[PDB]
Amino acid sequence: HTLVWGVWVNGVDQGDGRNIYIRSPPNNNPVKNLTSPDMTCNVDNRVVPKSVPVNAGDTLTFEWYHNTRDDDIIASSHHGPIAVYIAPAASNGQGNVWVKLFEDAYNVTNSTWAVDRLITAHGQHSVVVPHVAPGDYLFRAEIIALHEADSLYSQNPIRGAQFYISCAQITINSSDDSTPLPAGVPFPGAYTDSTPGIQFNIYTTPATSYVAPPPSVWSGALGGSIAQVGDASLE
Ligand SMILES: OC[C@H]1O[C@@H](O[C@H]2[C@H](O)[C@@H](O)[C@H](O[C@H]3[C@H](O)[C@@H](O)[C@H](O[C@H]4[C@H](O)[C@@H](O)[C@H](O)O[C@@H]4CO)O[C@@H]3CO)O[C@@H]2CO)[C@H](O)[C@@H](O)[C@@H]1O
Ligand SMILES: *[C@@H]1O[C@H](CO)[C@@H](O)[C@H](O)[C@H]1NC(C)=O
Ligand SMILES: [Cl-]
Ligand SMILES: [Cu+2]
């Protein structure tokens, strides 16, 4: 169980964003139903009042918490990958609009899942804002926890892959638009019971074998990290 508190821009904390620039759900409960509209931006998907300003090139940092800011972040059992997508806010998540900007499953060297490292990075991970058409966007951060993913939720509703999904409202101001945004995949829709990465047994299968659900990272993506950029206790 985990939620997003706010975002940083170029290492500058933008302040508490809950129900403000984040479309926050009432709680940190997982989404599990792959066909639910809840797969779009979780269970309380609606325009919230503000939208964070950025430029192409900027480093946008998501910040997750479990119960309170800079706490244990998310329970260690919840091993899994992490993705970020983007879409035009016009679409409100609907249609085939979602383009992936980032992916991190398992790191062979360090021998840690993305989530493992997110605990260590005080709940912070980042992407570099791409050169798309200025305007309003949604950035969808997605944690998949696989602690019960040896079953499918459709066949057993008290197990299955767990999605922790958070949509941030981001306004891109300065960009030259050298890589305009493509069409994307829909959510719900893009993940099924048969998609790879959705059913997987982390107790028997070695993490090295894990393949994250498609789609692939779009070519116009600029990376890419899971690491603390800010100190929240300093404020
Ligand atoms: O460890 C491997 C084993 O895991 C089993 O699944 C466990 C998870 O390991 C465990 O982390 C998970 O814990 C949940 C708990 O079920 C929730 O009820 C609880 O919900 C809290 C929330 O954390 C709070 O922040 C919020 O304020 O309130 C709610 C209500 O109390 O959150 C924790 C995680 O933080 O429980 C799972 C099952 O109970 C697998 O099932 C097993 O197969 C694996 O071998
Ligand atoms: C999953 O969501 C779909 C779409 O809202 C709904 O028809 C279905 O009842 C849900 N299934 C599970 C068991 O709930
Ligand atoms: Cl859980
Ligand atoms: Cu949980």
Swiss-Prot record:
GO terms for cellular component: extracellular region. The modification Methylhistidine is found at H1. Its main location: secreted. One of its GO terms (molecular function) is monooxygenase activity. (1,4-beta-D-glucosyl)n binds at V9, V47, V48, D58, N67, V129, R140. InterPro entries: AA9 (IPR049892), AA9_LPMO (IPR005103). The catalytically essential N-terminal histidine His-1 is post-translationally modified by methylation to prevent protonation of the histidine side chain, and protect the critical active site of the enzyme from oxidative damage. The polyphenol cinnamtannin B1 contained in methanolic extract of Cinnamomum cassia (cinnamon) acts as an inhibitor of catalytic activity. Cu(2+) binds at H1, H78, Y164. Pfam families: AA9. O2 binds at H147, Q162. Glycans are attached at N33, N110. Keywords: Carbohydrate metabolism, Cellulose degradation, Copper, Disulfide bond, Glycoprotein, Metal-binding, Methylation, Monooxygenase, Oxidoreductase, Polysaccharide degradation, Secreted, Signal. Its cofactor is Cu(2+). Binds 1 copper ion per subunit. Lignocellulose is the most abundant polymeric composite on Earth and is a recalcitrant but promising renewable substrate for industrial biotechnology applications. Together with cellobiose dehydrogenases (CDHs) an enzymatic system capable of oxidative cellulose cleavage is formed, which increases the efficiency of cellulases and put LPMOs at focus of biofuel research. The keyword Cell wall biogenesis/degradation does not apply. Its EC number is 1.14.99.56. It is found in: Secreted. Belongs to the polysaccharide monooxygenase AA9 family. Lytic polysaccharide monooxygenase (LPMO) that depolymerizes crystalline and amorphous polysaccharides via the oxidation of scissile alpha- or beta-(1-4)-glycosidic bonds, yielding C1 or C4 oxidation product. Catalysis by LPMOs requires the reduction of the active-site copper from Cu(II) to Cu(I) by a reducing agent and H(2)O(2) or O(2) as a cosubstrate. Is able to cleave phosphoric acid swollen cellulose (PASC) in the presence of a reducing agent, yielding a range of cellooligosaccharides dominated by cellobiose and cellotriose. This is AA9 family lytic polysaccharide monooxygenase A. It comes from Panus similis (Lentinoid fungus). The lineage of its organism: Eukaryota, Fungi, Dikarya, Basidiomycota, Agaricomycotina. The gene is LPMO9A.
